[PDB]
Write a protein that binds this ligand. Structure first.
Ligand SMILES: *[B@@]1(C2=[C][C]=C([C]([C][N]C([N])=[N])OC(=O)C3=[C][C]=[C]N=[C]3)[C]=[C]2)O[C][C]([C][O])O1
Length: 237
C-alpha cells in the first residue's frame, strides 16, 4: 500500500495474509474471510502454485512479526480459480480458498459481507484498500498492515486511463487523479472495503494497475458483486 498508514489491530478482521512455504516461507498475497471455511482472493496469486500444500493462511494478523514457526495457521484444502481467468488484466481475477479447517470467529477474525446485486446503484464514498504490500516501487513486504482511503472512479473514467486495456463491468477502479495512494506488489488478493450504512462490504479485490500510485493511473479491482452467483455456486457443497 502506497501512501497509507499503519492499521489498528482488529480494524480489518476479514483480512488474511496468505503465505507460501516454498522455497522458504513468505507472504504471497492478501485475502478476505467470507465464510467459516472460505477465503476470497485474486486468481493471479497462484501463478506457479502447483499444490495447495505449500499455502498457509493466517488470520487476525497485524504485524508479520506475529508470524513464526510456532504460530497457528489454516491449511488450504483446495484452490478454486474461476474457469475463465487467464490473467489479471483480462478480468476474472478471482479465486476461492477452501480451508482444511473452520475459522472460529472473534473480534480479530470475522467475515466481511459480500455486496448485494441491489447495491450496484449504491455510491460508496468510504472505501479503503489494505495490505502488507510495497510502500514504494521495487521495495519489499511491510511488517504492519497498511491502510489507505481511496475514492472509487467510474469505469468510463478508468477506461480513459487505460486506453490499451478493456475495462469491463466486472472490474472497478479506485485512485486519486493525482496518484499518491494505491495498492502495490504484495497487496494482490486483498480487499477493497467500503463502509456503507455502518456496514462493511467487500466491493473489490486488488487485481492490477500500472506501477504504483501514479498520476492518472487508478488501481483496478475485481468487481466482486459481479461474482456473487459464482461464489455461491463454488462454495455450495
Ligand atoms: B500482487 C500485485 C499487487 C499490485 C501490483 C501493482 C499494481 N497496483 C496498483 N497500481 N493498484 O504493480 C506493481 O507493484 C508493479 C508493476 C510493474 C512493475 N513494478 C511494480 C502488482 C502485483 O501482489 C502480489 C503479486 C503476486 O503475483 O501480485
Amino acid at each position: 500500500i502506497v501512501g497509507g498508514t499503519a492499521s489498528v489491530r482488529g480494524e480489518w478482521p476479514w483480512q488474511v495474509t496468505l503465505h507460501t512455504t516454498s522455497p522458504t516461507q513468505r507472504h504471497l498475497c492478501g485475502g478476505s474471510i467470507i465464510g467459516n471455511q472460505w477465503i476470497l482472493t485474486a486468481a493471479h496469486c497462484f501463478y506457479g502454485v502447483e499444490s495447495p500444500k505449500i499455502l498457509r493462511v493466517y488470520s487476525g494478523i497485524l504485524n508479520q512479526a506475529e508470524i513464526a514457526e510456532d504460530t497457528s495457521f489454516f491449511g488450504v484444502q483446495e484452490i478454486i480459480i474461476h474457469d475463465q481467468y487467464k490473467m489479471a488484466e483480462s478480468g476474472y481475477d478471482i479465486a476461492l480458498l477452501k480451508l482444511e479447517t473452520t475459522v472460529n470467529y472473534a473480534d480479530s477474525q470475522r467475515p466481511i459481507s459480500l455486496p448485494s446485486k441491489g447495491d450496484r446503484n449504491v455510491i460508496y464514498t468510504d472505501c479503503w484498500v489494505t495490505g502488507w504490500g510495497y510502500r514504494k516501487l521495487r521495495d519489499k513486504i511491510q511488517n504492519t498492515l497498511q491502510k489507505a482511503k481511496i475514492p472509487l472512479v467510474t469505469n468510463e473514467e478508468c477506461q480513459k486511463r487505460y486506453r490499451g486495456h478493456k475495462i469491463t463491468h466486472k472490474m472497478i477502479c479506485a485512485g486519486y487523479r493525482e496518484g499518491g495512494k494505491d495498492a502495490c506488489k504484495g497487496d494482490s488478493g486483498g480487499p477493497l472495503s467500503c463502509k456503507h450504512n455502518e456496514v462493511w462490504h467487500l466491493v473489490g479485490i486488488t487485481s492490477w494497475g500500472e506501477g504504483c500510485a501514479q498520476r492518472e493511473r487508478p488501481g483496478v479491482y475485481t468487481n466482486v458483486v459481479e461474482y456473487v452467483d459464482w461464489i455461491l455456486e463454488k462454495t455450495q457443497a
